Amino acid sequence: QPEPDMITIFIGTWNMGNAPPPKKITSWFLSKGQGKTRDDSADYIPHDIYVIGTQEDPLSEKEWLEILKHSLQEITSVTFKTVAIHTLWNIRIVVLAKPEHENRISHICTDNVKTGIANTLGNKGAVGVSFMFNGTSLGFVNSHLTSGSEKKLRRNQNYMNILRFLALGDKKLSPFNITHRFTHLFWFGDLNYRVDLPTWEAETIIQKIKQQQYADLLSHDQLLTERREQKVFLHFEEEEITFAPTYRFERLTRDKYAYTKQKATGMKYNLPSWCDRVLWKSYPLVHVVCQSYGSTSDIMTSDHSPVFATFEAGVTSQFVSKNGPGTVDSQGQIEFLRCYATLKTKSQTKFYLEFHSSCLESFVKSQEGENEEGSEGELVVKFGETLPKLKPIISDPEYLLDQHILISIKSSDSDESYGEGCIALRLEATETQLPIYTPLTHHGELTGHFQGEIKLQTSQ
Ligand SMILES: C(=C/c1ccccc1)/Nc1nc2ccccc2[nH]1
16 A cells, blocks of 8 residues: 555634534535635545644534534545544634544644733643654644724734644754744634724625625735734745635624624624635645635534635655664765854854754754855855865665755854744755755744755665
8 A cells, every 4th residue: 555645634723612513513524605716526535634722612512523423424435533632712723534443643742832921821822733644744734813993903913822842843953943843734713813804895795696796805815914014923825715704603604794892792894804824834835725715605604714724735755774773874965065044133142053854863053154244234154165074863865865964053142043034845856955945033023044056865
């Protein structure tokens, strides 16, 4: 039985509105309703992995797991295995996988982050799961961010707290947050960003929705605008939205948006909004293709509609040669030439690099770089040809060209990372000097850039 080089992943997010689900929720897992939907001819074909995020979930873990498993069995005639389930308050994540994957999945982590302080601590935050699937690291975050049209900045703060403090993936990657620890990272939930138009325009918005004319609404969606201004979700992707706003509906129909201020809303308006979202971030030059992104039309117990997204995702095998794992492969090397970091910091410490990768036996520390002043004020840290030669555990090009090098630039004075990035080894050529580049972030904000050239030697 051959190891896969692609899998399909289902991501679902649903704010259940504290109500039990209806007896049939199969449309969700079939990617049927509005938006980019799945072809009928694929209905019986199971996804490899199903990741279900709920918010305002009133069910026990047992109750929800029974509903999910029975739903997937009815669709696929497959009895899915539970990889992980984690709940914070009424925020939950379930990961299910085909039984044939049970001995491909390992290093399962779970964690949660509670957002806010005092007043604002007690119901919002995030849960997450990570694991390895053969040689590929996968992370999944379900977040329920702060509600309300006039709290977009709070949502952005909630995002930064979650990516700083959620402890998933390989703890040895100590300089790196979740935005760098995984081959593929999916972040979804009730992110609670709103369509930022005047209250007086509610009926006009509803009109536009009935005409399926979303362009003038999406141009005011706070998550798209905050992302465009680099305030949140830097370096994440989202598929184009082609489905109606998923909030706020009257329950038991989808015919009516309930937007007017009520005591139950704290006297706030809930203009129709795309609260419920799926985003991803994959390492450079790894295959990832969104094959569905939409909302169901027939699940009406909540004031939100369920959202689905599905993905093709490239995966690699658990590589064994005669040499690595447990020795180097003298036939392999990675050389960095003419490298420099450009940093936005105002500090004057020396910096060194760390190179982290599962193709190395352990991370590698460089010598300190040489600080210069850039033309437009910036700090430039020059490494020249001083960087260590990296010795990968396996030299086979079928392995090595699929790997990635994480880079952290650290202060000599504090050993704190000032910036993190990632370089793909999927090069156009081996034994050839080629340009490399990554942006550098810290706490998911842009802090600089790293650029130079690489020279990769494989056994071919
Ligand atoms: C281009 C413009 C845009 C971005 C966010 C929101 C709206 C428009 N899209 C985009 N450029 C990227 C570069 C690196 C990683 C991801 C990226 N996504």
